């Protein structure tokens, strides 16, 4: 949801001894898939700082006990020599897509908000095959395959989905 | 499009005529108070956040709605210019 590099003021800046630009980095961060375990974790702030000749990968974040990062080898940046990179990246549990302009998170006055990508699913596909058993051949066999970034599971999603569907079905109760 | 614009047009001898009557009538709806209507009972205009179009959303909408019915009369010289506005203030608070 938001990021802050120590010596950087705006999203369009460049950090010494650091190939990639702020924009190139934050972009790569939206590719970061984290996973919390309990509601008690609404807004977690991951912290990371590495220096010198090294490659910063999402595993270099200092562990946050209950919440885990399934996006380890994600390339965050490449550091040359005297490459000082210390940053705090804010994370949240939400739903849908939120433009960095809509929320505008401000932990530190000089931090830059990032675009929100909350769908834990990349793609859904369903097929309707002809038969399994039955008196009549004209039958439907629905098999749906779901794909998840890792945050939640195929089954987990399916269930929540089913629930949201049911939840709406009830809204047909009180006429007027 | 509009509510019975067809009916409306058929009530006047000329298009532009309609507009004029429509307008001036919207004027009287607000000037001499907003209760100077003729079809306020059941079947009067309405809005959807609440049923408050019953007070003062769009004037013209009323006008036309009122003219659709044989309540009002319009003519070249129906009533003496000045006398009209004097009597109206008196009977409308």
């Amino acid at each position: 949801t938001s990021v802050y590099i120590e010596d950087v003021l705006h999203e369009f800046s460049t950090i010494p001894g650091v190939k990639e630009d702020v924009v190139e980095i934050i972009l790569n961060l939206k590719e970061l898939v984290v996973r919390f375990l309990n509601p008690s974790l609404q807004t977690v702030t991951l912290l990371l700082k590495a220096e010198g000749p090294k490659e910063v990968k999402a595993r270099d974040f200092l562990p946050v006990a209950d919440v885990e990062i399934m996006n380890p080898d994600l390339h965050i940046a490449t550091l040359e020599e005297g490459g000082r990179l210390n940053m705090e990246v804010r994370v949240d549990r939400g739903v849908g897509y939120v433009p960095a302009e809509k929320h505008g998170i401000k932990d530190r006055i000089n931090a830059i908000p990032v675009d929100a990508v909350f769908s834990p699913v990349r793609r859904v596909a369903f097929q309707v095959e002809d038969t399994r058993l039955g008196q009549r051949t004209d039958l439907d066999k629905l098999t749906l395959r779901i794909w998840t970034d890792g945050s939640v599971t195929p089954l987990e999603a399916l269930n929540q989905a089913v629930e949201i569907l049911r939840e709406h079905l009830t809204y047909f109760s009180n006429p007027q | 499009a509009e509510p019975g614009i067809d009916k409306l047009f058929g009530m006047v001898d000329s298009k532009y005529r309609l507009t004029v009557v429509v307008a001036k009538r919207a004027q009287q709806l607000l000037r001499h108070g907003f209760k100077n209507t003729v079809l306020e009972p059941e079947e009067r205009p309405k809005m959807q956040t609440l049923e408050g179009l019953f007070d003062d959303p769009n004037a013209v909408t009323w006008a036309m709605k009122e003219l659709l019915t044989g309540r009002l009369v319009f003519g070249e010289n129906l009533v003496p210019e000045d006398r009209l506005q004097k009597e109206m203030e008196r009977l409308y608070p």
Partner: protein, 1083 residues
């Protein structure tokens, strides 16, 4: 990603130095890189020798011109508004009548701009471009007569503008007609003047004409010879002393009027060949020996009589033939003005020869850099030819760097006469793109030059061909002159070859702009490549061969307006020039020599060459382009890498990996949605916004000055007179706004105070963003040119991220242009059998009417590339073919449907249903298995697609693929002012704007009529009153509305009132009247 290219026409030689036009033109223009011992013969030095040997006795001669210490550096010139010029002086020596004495010395005569490595210039702050120019190359031509279908007339045209316009005509009544500048005179009269005697003249001239009876006629004026020189002078319109005052005749002699173009090929070319033969000197110049020599005159007439007689050689000259059309390279353009300055200086020095004590006068007393500087300076900053460098994106600037204009000096071509010039002439082949011209007025008049088109010694755009002998094709290429190309029978490059031997009997060729089927024995020359027929700009459209020329244009021009996107993607399908454009354009940074990398900073890149040198290459971090676009160099090399010579170290603005990229490759379904893609609307998937697919960075440069009023200097400080502290936060630096701050509409960007007050640069309504760079120029100026009155200047750079939204307009290289109508949630947009949804949905309907199949092609090939994971390079006319694409699509079916078979499942009940409607449609061969069927349907370039909203298929295969589409410099940021009320002009009472208040749209009479017609009485009244002039009307109106009331009735518009008085102010008495003609009061 593998890169496969389908080129079969052996592209013999690589494309030339794309910006050579300007580059070399300036190099040869001002030979300042090499010594004067071998100093050139043209440009600068030539213009020097021109007006240098001064003779008023006085004698000031040229020695050597040297220049080379650039006051300041490029960037500095931009940040300081300074013009990047070189200091220019030269050694001049003055010889005296007193043979024993002479004077040598040096005088600096102004600064001349320099040419960047890209080819652009830097005048006052910004970068400008000197565009090419075309015209009637000063020569001699013969065109048919106006009305009289009889005989034709002769023309003699030499620039510059000062030079005389000569024509030659023969009439019924009698003899010759040689009109110079609005008047005519006997052609003989002059001949006699020069020495051509009746006898000698007639003999050699009429030895075949019989017209001669036209010339030998003088029996009265033809018997006096010199006296005819005086006779001619009388024929000057003005009354002047008949004492041999060569003057006006001196004018059309050798010096000014005709031309000082390089002796030999400049004008002489039009001589030798076209008519007559040898040239003496530079022009019809010879005022030596009391008598005159004009080896040009008689020939012109000597061809007139040949022209009207036989076929001594058929010379009917086609004006527009590029062979009588020259292109003015920057150099010639700058050099031109240079000699004008040279002339202007030479003017005063002659005056300063009689003005002073002999030896008391030396260099200074004869030289004043005043003329030359104003001269040159004027051209770069005032000439209608030097302009803002269209830098929306590199390519753009590059085109604008090489386009040819007809309008300019005015002596070459004007506005109201062009139907003839506007056409793409026969000769434009390989010399002028037939597609690059712009739509609308100014069409065909301004156009970019061709691929291999390179300007020769004197303009005539030459093009490359391949000499062929017998059935053998050669690599020996020659750059022919438009005229020389007609002499031969050239053939196309499409001609099948077995290496060096032709392959067919009836092999196409074009004689002289005429299509002719020739034999292998007659093919004298062959075309180099199809590329040369078009421009660089055009050469970028994939399947141009399948695209109507009219829309192709839209396609070429649209690339010029592509905007730099953070994520730059090269086209899934390319032409073959993308690499080159980024390369000769200077977007990306290449490695000079082989070696290794040292430091790969995000601001600099230091590499060590294996030869013995380690260089630090800074990378323009984030610079403000002329058009307000991001220009960053993103290193693509890792620390310690062995780099090959000429390898991309860092990527340019839109060129990622070294390829040109503008916009991105998106998956696209080509079908109709509700109406969201009605006439030319486009539907976009929210999914695109999510991966910042289409996002460009933009910068706006707001500038404020601390003017010096006689009321008290406008200071620049944090002191905001009206007591705000909440609006003074961001403005932390005393006066300036802090870097990294978020400026919204109405915040203070810079503060200032002036006399009776807060005058502060605020964020103009619309938007601002994040302040990223700031510039302040205080008192002790380092090397900047601060205008007068201007105490100090403050520049504030602001930027923001442009995410694609509904107003934005994108478009493909073929010509499909359009705006985003609805941003659809991936949730319910057209998805493929396998979860993959599409990105954009183009409305089919916009393809038939406009003729650009090319896009539907790109999409098919693009479909293969998606599942084949590969990019392709399809040449202009020689690219990929319909069979080869189906072949790659067949390969793609094994990736798409192949993994499908193994992954564990078969065909959907949906897939079967659309197959039914497809066979009944005639897309699939009835009787084959769904597997087989779908393949045949995929090869067609169409697959099955389910709705997404209903999950039900869309009856009928729909084509889909990777189409390369771009976002244009059209943000809606420039498209919406919403005004309720505000500032009015104090002179006319118009809601003009300026800072906080937007303007109101004009209503014009064109629109009033619109209203009148409707019978829109008050709607019209309102537009002329309550909304414009009745200061009491608009007032009552405002109030009323504040009250939720009914606007008052209109009083006499001040315009009425103002008229009564304007009419009272004069005798006229305008009195308004009542029913019965009586008075009435406006007041």
């Amino acid at each position: 990603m593998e890169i496969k290219r389908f080129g079969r026409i052996r592209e013999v030689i690589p494309l030339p130095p794309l910006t050579e036009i300007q580059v070399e033109s300036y190099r040869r223009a001002l030979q300042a890189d090499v010594p004067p011992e071998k100093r050139e013969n043209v440009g600068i030095q030539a213009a020097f020798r021109e007006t240098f040997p001064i003779e008023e006795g006085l004698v000031l001669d040229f020695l050597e011109y040297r220049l080379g210490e650039p006051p300041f550096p490029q960037d500095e010139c931009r940040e300081k508004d300074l013009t990047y010029q070189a200091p220019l002086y030269a050694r001049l020596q003055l010889i005296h009548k007193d043979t024993g004495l002479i004077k040598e010395d040096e005088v600096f005569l102004g600064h001349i701009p320099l040419m960047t490595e890209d080819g652009s210039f830097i005048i006052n702050g910004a970068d400008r471009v000197i565009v090419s120019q075309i015209h009637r190359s000063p020569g001699v031509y013969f065109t048919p007569d106006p009305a009289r279908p009889g005989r034709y007339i002769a023309s003699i045209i030499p620039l510059p503008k000062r030079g005389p316009w000569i024509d030659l005509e023969v009439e019924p009544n009698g003899v010759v007609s040689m009109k110079v500048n609005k008047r005519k005179f006997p052609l003989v009269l002059l001949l006699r003047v020069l020495g051509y005697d009746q006898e000698t003249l007639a003999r050699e001239l009429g030895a075949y004409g019989e017209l001669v009876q036209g010339l030998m006629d003088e029996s009265v004026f033809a018997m006096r010879p010199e006296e005819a020189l005086i006779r001619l002078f009388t024929l000057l319109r003005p009354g002047d002393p008949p004492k041999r005052d060569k003057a006006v005749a001196y004018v059309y002699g050798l010096i000014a009027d005709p031309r000082r173009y390089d002796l030999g090929e400049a004008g002489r070319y039009k001589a030798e060949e076209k008519l007559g033969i040898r040239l003496s000197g530079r022009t019809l110049a010879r005022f030596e020996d009391g008598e005159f020599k004009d080896e040009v005159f008689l020939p012109t007439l000597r061809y007139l009589f040949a022209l009207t007689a036989g076929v001594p050689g058929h010379e009917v000259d086609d004006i527009d033939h590029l062979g009588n059309r020259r292109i003015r390279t920057v150099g010639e353009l700058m050099t031109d003005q240079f000699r004008v300055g040279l002339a202007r200086l030479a003017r005063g020095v002659r005056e300063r020869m009689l003005m002073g004590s002999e030896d008391s006068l030396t260099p200074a007393k004869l030289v004043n850099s005043r003329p030359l500087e104003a001269a040159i300076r004027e051209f770069f900053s005032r000439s209608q030819l030097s302009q803002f460098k269209d830098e929306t994106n590199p390519l753009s600037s590059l085109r604008h760097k090489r386009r040819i204009s007809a309008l300019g000096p005015g002596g070459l071509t004007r506005e109201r006469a062009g139907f003839d010039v506007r056409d793409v002439h026969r000769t434009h082949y390989g010399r002028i793109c037939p597609v690059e011209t712009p739509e609308g007025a100014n069409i065909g008049l301004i156009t970019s030059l061709a691929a291999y088109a390179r300007v020769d010694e004197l303009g005539f755009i030459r093009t490359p061909y391949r000499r062929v002998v017998g059935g053998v094709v050669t690599d020996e290429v020659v750059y022919m002159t438009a005229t020389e190309e007609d002499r031969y029978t050239i053939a196309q490059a499409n001609t099948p070859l077995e290496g060096n031997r032709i392959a067919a009997e009836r092999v196409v060729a074009r004689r002289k702009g005429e299509p002719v089927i020739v034999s292998p024995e007659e093919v004298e020359f062959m075309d180099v490549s199809p590329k040369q027929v078009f421009s660089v700009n055009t050469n970028l459209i994939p399947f141009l061969e399948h695209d109507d020329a009219n829309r192709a244009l839209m396609g070429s021009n649209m690339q010029t307006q592509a905007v730099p996107l953070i994520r730059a993607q090269a086209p899934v399908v390319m032409t073959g020039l993308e690499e080159r454009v980024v390369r000769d354009s200077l977007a990306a940074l290449y490695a000079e020599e082989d070696g290794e990398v040292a430091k790969v900073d995000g601001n600099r890149i230091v590499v060590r060459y294996e030869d013995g040198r380690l260089v630090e290459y800074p990378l323009r971090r984030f610079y403000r382009s002329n058009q307000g676009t991001a220009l960053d160099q993103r290193p693509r090399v890792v620390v310690g890498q062995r780099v090959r010579k000429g390898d991309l170290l860092a990527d340019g603005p839109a060129s990622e990996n070294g390829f040109l990229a503008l916009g991105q490759n998106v998956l696209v379904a080509i079908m109709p949605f509700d109406g969201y893609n009605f006439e030319d609307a486009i539907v976009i998937s929210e999914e695109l916004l999510k991966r910042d697919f289409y996002t460009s960075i933009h910068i706006e440069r707001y500038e404020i000055e601390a003017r010096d009023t006689k009321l008290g200097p406008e200071r620049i400080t944090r002191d905001i007179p009206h007591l705000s502290e909440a609006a003074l936060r961001d403005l932390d630096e005393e006066g300036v706004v802090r870097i990294g701050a978020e400026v919204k509409p109405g915040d203070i960007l810079v503060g200032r105070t002036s006399f009776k007050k807060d005058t502060s640069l605020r964020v103009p309504p619309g938007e601002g963003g994040i302040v990223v760079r700031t510039v302040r120029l205080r008192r002790g100026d380092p090397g900047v040119e601060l205008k007068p009155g201007v105490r100090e200047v403050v520049r504030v750079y602001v930027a923001q991220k442009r995410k694609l939204q509904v107003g934005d307009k994108l478009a493909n290289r073929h010509g499909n242009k359009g705006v985003v109508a609805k941003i659809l949630p991936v949730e319910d947009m057209p998805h493929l059998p396998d979860g993959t949804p599409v990105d954009v949905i183009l409305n089919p309907l916009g393809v038939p009417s406009r003729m650009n199949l090319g896009q539907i092609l790109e999409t098919h090939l693009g479909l293969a590339g998606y599942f084949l994971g590969q990019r392709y390079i399809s040449p202009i006319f020689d690219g990929a073919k319909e069979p080869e694409i189906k072949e790659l699509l067949a390969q793609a079916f094994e990736v798409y449907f192949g993994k499908r078979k193994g992954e564990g499942f078969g065909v959907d009940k949906r897939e079967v249903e659309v197959l039914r409607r497809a066979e009944k449609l005639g897309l699939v061969t009835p009787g084959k298995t769904p597997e087989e069927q779908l393949k045949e349907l995929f090869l067609q370039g169409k697959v099955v697609l389910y709705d997404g909203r209903t999950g039900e298929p869309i009856e009928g295969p729909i084509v889909v693929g990777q189409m390369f589409i771009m976002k244009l410099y059209h943000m809606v940021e420039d498209k919406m002012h919403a005004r309720s009320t505000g500032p009015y002009s104090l002179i006319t009472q118009q809601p003009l704007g300026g800072k906080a208040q937007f303007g109101g749209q004009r209503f014009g009479e064109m629109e009033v009529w619109a209203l009148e017609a409707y019978g829109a009485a008050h709607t019209l009244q309102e537009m002329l009153t309550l909304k414009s002039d009745d200061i009491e009307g608009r007032n009552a109106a405002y109030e009323a509305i504040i009250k939720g009331e009914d606007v008052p009735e209109p009083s006499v518009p001040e315009s009425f009132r103002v008229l009564v008085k304007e009419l009272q102010a004069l005798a006229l008495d305008v009195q308004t009247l009542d029913e019965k003609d009586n008075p009435v009061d406006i007041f």
